[PDB]
Design a protein around this ligand. Sequence first.
Ligand SMILES: Cc1cn(C[C@H](N)C(=O)O)c(=O)n(Cc2cc(-c3ccccc3)sc2C(=O)O)c1=O
Ligand SMILES: Cc1cn(C[C@H](N)C(=O)O)c(=O)n(Cc2cc(-c3ccccc3)sc2C(=O)O)c1=O
Ligand SMILES: [Cl-]
Lengths: 251, 251
Amino acid sequence: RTLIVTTILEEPYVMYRKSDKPLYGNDRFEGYCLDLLKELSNILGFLYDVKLVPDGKYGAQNDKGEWNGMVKELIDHRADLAVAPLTITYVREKVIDFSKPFMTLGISILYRKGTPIDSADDLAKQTKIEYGAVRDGSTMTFFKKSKISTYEKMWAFMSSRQQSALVKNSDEGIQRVLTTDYALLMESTSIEYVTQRNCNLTQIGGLIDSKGYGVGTPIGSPYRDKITIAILQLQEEGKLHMMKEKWWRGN
Amino acid sequence: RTLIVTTILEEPYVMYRKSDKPLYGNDRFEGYCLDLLKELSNILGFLYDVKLVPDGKYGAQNDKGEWNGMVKELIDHRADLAVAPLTITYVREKVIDFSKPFMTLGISILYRKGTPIDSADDLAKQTKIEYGAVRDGSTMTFFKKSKISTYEKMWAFMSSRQQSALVKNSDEGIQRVLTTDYALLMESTSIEYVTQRNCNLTQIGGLIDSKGYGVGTPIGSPYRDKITIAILQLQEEGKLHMMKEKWWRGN
Ligand SMILES: Cc1cn(C[C@H](N)C(=O)O)c(=O)n(Cc2cc(-c3ccccc3)sc2C(=O)O)c1=O
Ligand SMILES: Cc1cn(C[C@H](N)C(=O)O)c(=O)n(Cc2cc(-c3ccccc3)sc2C(=O)O)c1=O
Ligand SMILES: [Cl-]
């Protein structure tokens, strides 16, 4: 059995190689997730075929209970694995299985260096420095759903200043950080990636929530626990560290 | 079926209540893990009976492949669950199953406030400020097994200065931090706990490795995936955050 692996274009996890060389199949791609998949394939001993998810979506449900994205590919048995920056969530665990996480992350703060600002609590109580999130993203939703008073206050500030505080996408948010007196609430993984590449930018404080990226499988897949095992071995032997360092490290 | 839950005395996860009131069974105990277990019991709908692991050990193997501690309790079917600060590891996954993690942690640095020291790389290249770990602990072992050059250098410094750099236990390490020009490499969870209680102390840098605490079950237990589900719901509804804040927050 050659395993079909669903994934999604997303820097630095999955990219097309910058090459016009004759590269076919899996060799057309590079990135953290491709390196992970190679290691998994060598530990478990499987052949695989990487296929980009046709609709370019991660996976969400409609009101009929119909799914899209990589999740739908797994549900339909059109992929054996999803290897992507795919969050392990309660709702998704109802319909697919996941390995234990190969990467753990949390919402954090992207801001300029050399400022007394040190936490989310430092931002919440003031109005001089604007702060927000990508409109309708996971980070915005966290703040909308939060019953923690200090994040309830932050959401109230974001929701009332909806037009300016909430941005269209990650790229626009980073641009707003570099140009105005603004802080972007975003995932720690993305902050690490940006701060490595922009020396004027830094992470502020720690993690505001916690979640993991895991390898998705159909419910009952005999590969799920094997992949957990492989992930733990890669973690303990320092290989996850070196794969992260390969793709995240800047100049 | 009343589930037998193996656990271990460990502040703030599992403690005896400071009370001479007539408290029996589960009511004799308090702590993060007791709160977690209560929530798990209410989501899944199980009765349970907390039993402290007789040998007071987490779980390790000898050369005959014989296990001890909470791991051995699970292997022997003398406990249905282990709910404790029990690390999900490759070797343990060979003999027991684990839920996905309810807490994620990594080695970090405990040091004084107001110093230019900001990372492990800042410590490694100098000798004026001594640094180390608890002798024969998980943190020391990480440095001993590491093939990362900057941690190889740190281990070389710890191993050559073996008598003074390596301490007997966590309590001795913290005391060495507060009295001498010294930094203790320790788990982020414990650093958070200490820094909340000592205002002269701070965490330095980020996480040096990554691991999770999970609920242990015997291999094949039908509770493992259910507990993962419950953990994700507690995470997403902010309950893991508030349980952490209950036990970790200082004065
Ligand atoms: C790599 C990555 C993936 N995902 C998808 C998510 N992990 C999932 O599993 O659905 C994800 O939500 N984020 C965070 C994120 C992305 C966002 C985005 C939305 C539209 C256009 C461009 C970016 S917003 C956002 C966030 O943190 O809120 C990521 O950084
Ligand atoms: C709460 C906790 C548990 N464990 C056990 C470990 N999680 C396991 O699953 O075996 C664990 O290793 N650590 C870290 C740790 C404890 C240590 C200790 C050893 C002897 C006497 C007193 C303390 S040393 C240490 C470390 O980080 O190296 C913990 O902080
Ligand atoms: Cl699992």
